[PDB]
């Protein structure tokens, strides 16, 4: 039951991409993918139950070593702890519904089976990454999910914008991966082994934490690395949902939680800055997908702050990930359903009424919005309040800035989420498309997401939920009031006169433009200078005419 959690999606994806798929068709490919996802999900549920509740960690010898030269020893070995069990359970539960939705959304796509196979590869490599006991397998999972994301974003190879976005994201993640590789070099040189269980550190040389955090921020799309995330909406809805729910974006935070070898000051500063930037970004746009992506970034920043707080903060951050994934995927899927009912319209300004879409999709979007904004007694409510309370008691004076920033960010989160729902349904109709699709499978996927959200409340992620921390009565009620304020302001749907601030905010602070010409055009010029001026010039040896 243990190795079923990893090998089964991989085998399913291999079959879906094998020449065997020629003899099956899209019907058969969908059947195979759904069956593989369900079986892996059952295995993951069993493993989660046993590990979390009965505390049984199991280590696996899989393929022997991978390579052992010198004191460096690398082995195909898998270990399942509480962290690995949580990650596997979350990823499988997300990706099962993601596959269910993708089996219906792209029904009129020509090459559906390739899409299914790449999704299965993405899920399997995520399972590989989380199953890692040593850092090399973590790297393998990192690059495998990167490759799968590259293929999935560039699925529609006929649109240049998607190709540009994929290449940009790949290069940014490769910068992060070089930083991570340098950190791995340092970790092995100063610790002599790669298994996380053999990594217990009290005070490193600083570069360890710095480089590891930079590499993690690369995957988590934090400050100075978030630009790629918005452009990823060029890909199909299932890819964005899977990436933003439980994979890729989660991997950096997962590595940080597994390691717990960071530096609190830099972690807190980066997380707070990224959260504030994501919050101000999400309320200032009109593309539906970009807002949800920026919300993903904001929750990533929340988790960063939590893990920077401490070990308890790290576990709370892991629980925040576990609760965030479900409703993030739910929001993505509901947005995709509404968009398809809107004739592919991906802009908010042409929506309205209760005629374009089904009742279940509307209710699912409502529930996901309520959970994400921290509505009292809900899934995101518990994790967000726990992180806030643990951040309202930190011993770092730096954290005081972070607490205020996160309060503002949560208020803005409620603001733009309520604006999203308001523009989706509450406003009058202002588009031209009504094709309400009421197919069983995506509705069932939404149902599974909502059931998992219910479980996350009826059953806590860890023992932290319910652990009461002693705050003044106003302090606890503060995020509730902030969400109420966001509700009021968004239901007013009002705006300001300071239009220069508006044009600045909408531009995403010009970060893409800044990176367009500070490093990039100079890289191009350095390349031309090197080649032409040196090789054909200074390094050139001409001909002796005669």
């Amino acid at each position: 039951m243990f190795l079923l959690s990893v090998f089964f999606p991989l085998l399913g994806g291999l079959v879906n991409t094998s020449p065997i798929a020629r003899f099956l068709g899209h019907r058969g490919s969908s059947i195979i993918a759904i069956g593989c996802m369900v079986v892996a999900f059952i295995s993951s549920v069993v493993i989660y139950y046993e590990v979390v509740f009965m505390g049984c960690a199991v280590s696996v010898d899989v393929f022997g070593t991978w390579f052992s030269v010198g004191t460096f020893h690398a082995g195909w070995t898998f270990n399942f702890d509480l962290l690995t069990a949580n990650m596997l359970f979350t990823v499988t539960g997300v990706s099962m519904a993601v596959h269910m939705y993708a089996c219906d959304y792209m029904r009129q796509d020509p090459h559906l089976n390739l899409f299914l196979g790449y999704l299965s590869y993405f899920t399997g490599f995520m399972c590989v990454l989380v199953a890692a006991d040593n850092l090399l397998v973590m790297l393998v999972g990192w690059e495998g999910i990167g490759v799968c994301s590259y293929l999935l974003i560039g699925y529609w190879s006929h649109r240049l914008s998607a190709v540009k976005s994929a290449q940009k994201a790949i290069l940014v993640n490769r910068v992060s991966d070089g930083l991570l590789m340098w950190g791995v070099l340092w970790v092995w040189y100063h610790l002599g082994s790669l298994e996380y269980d053999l990594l217990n550190v009290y005070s490193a040389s600083g570069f360890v934490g710095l480089s590891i955090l930079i590499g993690a921020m690369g995957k988590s799309a934090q400050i100075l690395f978030h630009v790629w995330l918005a452009d990823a909406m060029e890909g199909p809805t299932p890819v964005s949902a899977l990436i933003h729910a439980a994979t890729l974006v989660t991997a950096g935070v997962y590595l940080l939680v597994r390691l717990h070898i960071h530096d609190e000051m830099f972690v807190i500063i980066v997380g707070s800055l990224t959260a504030f930037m994501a919050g101000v970004f999400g309320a200032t746009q009109s593309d539906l997908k970009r807002v949800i992506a920026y919300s993903t970034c904001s929750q990533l920043g929340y988790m960063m702050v939590s893990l920077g707080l401490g070990e308890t903060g790290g576990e709370a951050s892991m629980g925040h990930l576990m609760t965030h994934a479900s409703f993030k995927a739910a929001l993505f899927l509901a947005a995709g359903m509404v968009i398809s009912g809107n004739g592919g319209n991906q802009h908010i300004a042409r929506y309205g009424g209760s005629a374009h879409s089904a009742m279940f999709t509307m209710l699912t979007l409502m529930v996901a919005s309520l959970s994400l904004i921290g509505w009292p007694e809900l899934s995101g409510f518990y994790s967000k309040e726990t992180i806030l309370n643990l951040a309202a008691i930190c011993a770092d004076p730096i954290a005081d800035v972070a607490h205020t920033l996160l309060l503002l960010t949560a208020m803005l989160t409620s603001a733009y989420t309520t604006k999203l729902f308001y523009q989706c349904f509450m406003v009058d109709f202002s588009g031209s498309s009504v094709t309400p699709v009421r197919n069983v499978l995506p509705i069932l996927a939404m149902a599974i997401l909502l059931l998992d959200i219910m479980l996350k409340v009826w059953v806590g992620t860890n023992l932290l939920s319910g652990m009461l921390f002693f705050l003044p009565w106003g302090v606890k009620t503060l995020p509730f009031g902030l969400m109420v304020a966001g509700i009021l302001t968004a239901t007013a749907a009002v705006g300001s006169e300071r239009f220069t601030l508006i044009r600045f905010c909408g531009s995403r602070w010009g970060f893409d433009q800044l990176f367009a010409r500070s490093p990039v055009n100079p890289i191009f010029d350095l390349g031309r200078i090197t080649w032409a001026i040196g090789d054909r010039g200074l390094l050139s040896v001409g001909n002796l005419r005669a």
Partner: protein, 125 residues
């Protein structure tokens, strides 16, 4: 609804630039440069000078509270000491440099504990 008709990119008919290897022509109109914003217009017609001018104040406005709180207020601001643990238990927990228990100003070796907590970068021989 695949199969929408798409305009093609007609082949060039005049001498190419020396550095033409920055325009991305995928065969369909419209093409794009190697990267967005690299040359030509920007959405909103803003310029780099505009954003540099704005950031010249926005960055310091964001950074100012960090420096003020890190340079004018200490652990005495919190009305409680960190979570207490027995000596044989605390003695390992505080060994971590990232560990927050170092900020107990009531610690018997408080200044010494903070002394060990500084961060180095080059390993010393």
């Amino acid at each position: 609804g695949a199969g929408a008709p798409v305009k093609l990119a007609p082949r060039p008919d005049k001498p190419l630039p020396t550095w033409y290897e920055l325009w991305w022509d995928n065969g369909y109109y419209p093409g794009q440069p190697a990267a967005d914003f690299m040359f030509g217009a920007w959405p909103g017609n803003m310029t780099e000078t505009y954003y540099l001018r704005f950031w010249s104040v926005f960055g310091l406005a964001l950074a100012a509270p960090f420096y003020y709180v890190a340079n004018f207020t200490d652990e005495t601001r919190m009305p409680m000491v960190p979570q207490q643990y027995p000596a044989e238990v605390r003695d390992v927990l505080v060994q971590r440099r990232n560990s927050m228990l170092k900020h107990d100003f009531s610690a018997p070796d408080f200044k010494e504990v903070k002394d060990r907590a500084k961060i180095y970068w080059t390993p010393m021989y």
